[PDB]
Design a binder for these strands. Structure first.
Ligand SMILES: Nc1ccn([C@H]2C[C@H](O)[C@@H](COP(=O)(O)NP(=O)(O)OP(=O)(O)O)O2)c(=O)n1
Ligand SMILES: [Mg+2]
Ligand SMILES: [Mg+2]
Length: 347
DNA sequence: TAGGACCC
DNA sequence: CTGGGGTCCTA
């Protein structure tokens, strides 16, 4: 027997949800983000269709930047309520195949299938793709392996509308010549540090001395970076419901603020909007954090713990404004944010 | 508590 | 020019 980890990720998620109700746009570049107005600044692309992506438009790109690259593109406002309902339709369907399923964000899910050696995991992936296609109209891609991070990397090669199997038989074959940030968990900043140390590929990272990576990244991050290069990762798929450790709300304003009454007002409204939402889900606040971005993108965040776990609205607003006054507040502010950290439950 | 570094 | 919402680790 072999314990396979299957990673399901939805193709161009937000675009496909819109394309499902707009057959007029089937072949045209569709861009989701910020009220559907490409003139608006400080708004970014949250999804670009595969057609729009061939123009170089990707997630996080400003709307006006995307308008420059693809003028022919239909811009749609983001509709989170529609994406949530499409997400639960997909996921409430992925649990009813009788497998351990670890939901991971709206777009992705890890599925555990302990199959006999004579049985092919591709047959499970082939089923997943078309029960999702036949009952939601959305297309997915499945990555197959024996750990989450490698199944995740396998999904990248399966896109679009495909399946890709990645194992130790072909791991270093496929990934050896790739840069470090091709692994899940390592990004641009670590890849830059490794390049300055002579490590430029996954293969070179996999045979790097541990007491060279640990004394450069941390005692456990160093060894974890070494596992990842070897194709290892997390192997337990847990169907337990995830409990959020915190919830937050941030806003970038159209023009940078200057008056503090507006800053005291934004922090208070953000704090009360977040508090009302955690009360609804039955949570209790432990600490209050406030974030300031400034025009030069200098963002730091301060946090204060409450005397006791509370959800009192007067106390949390007072605490948020008290953390805000702890801030220097010289330059114009670009973004203010409130994050309420939640007591790690009970029932 | 602060802050860097991922990721969707 | 550089959104919004999360989490884990390290100093
Ligand atoms: N930086 C990002 C990345 C994704 N998202 C949202 C929008 C995505 O449609 C959705 C799915 O995340 P994603 O799989 O990484 N990208 P997306 O599914 O849109 O395109 P592909 O998976 O086909 O490459 O999360 C976001 O809001 N900001
Ligand atoms: Mg996706
Ligand atoms: Mg995804």
């Amino acid at each position: 027997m072999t314990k396979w980890v299957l990673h399901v990720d939805l193709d161009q998620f937000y675009a496909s949800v819109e394309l499902r109700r707009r057959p007029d746009l089937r072949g045209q570049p569709v861009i989701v983000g910020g009220s559907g107005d490409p003139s608006e600044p400080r708004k970014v692309v949250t999804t670009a269709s595969y057609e729009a992506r061939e123009f170089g438009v990707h997630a996080g790109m400003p709307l006006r930047a995307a308008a420059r690259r693809c003028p022919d593109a239909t811009f749609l406002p983001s509709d989170p309520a529609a994406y949530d309902e499409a997400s639960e339709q997909v996921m409430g369907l992925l649990r009813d195949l009788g497998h351990p399923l670890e939901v991971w964000g709206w777009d992705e899910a890890y599925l555990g299938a302990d199959l006999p050696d004579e049985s092919d995991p591709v047959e499970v992936a082939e089923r997943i793709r078309t029960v999702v296609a036949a009952e939601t109209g959305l297309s997915c891609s499945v990555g197959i392996s024996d750990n989450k991070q490698r199944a995740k990397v396998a999904t990248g090669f399966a896109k679009p509308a495909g399946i890709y199997v990645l194992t130790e038989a072909n791991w270093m074959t496929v990934m050896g010549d790739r840069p470090p940030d091709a692994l899940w968990g390592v990004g641009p900043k670590t890849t830059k540090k490794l390049a300055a140390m002579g490590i430029t590929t996954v293969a070179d990272l996999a045979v790097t001395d541990p007491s060279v990576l640990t004394t450069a990244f941390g005692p456990s991050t160093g060894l974890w970076l070494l596992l990842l290069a070897k194709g290892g990762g997390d192997t337990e798929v847990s169907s337990e419901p995830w409990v959020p450790r915190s919830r937050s709300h941030v806003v970038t304003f159209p023009q940078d603020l200057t008056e503090r009454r507006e800053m005291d007002s934004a922090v208070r409204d953000l704090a009360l909007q977040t508090l009302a939402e955690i009360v609804e889900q039955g949570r209790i606040v432990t600490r209050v954090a406030v974030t300031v971005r400034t025009s030069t993108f200098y963002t730091r965040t301060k946090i204060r713990k409450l005397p006791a776990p509370s959800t009192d609205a007067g106390q949390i607003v007072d605490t948020a404004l008290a953390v805000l006054d702890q801030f220097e507040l010289d330059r114009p502010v670009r973004l203010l944010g409130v994050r309420l950290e939640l007591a790690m439950d009970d029932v």
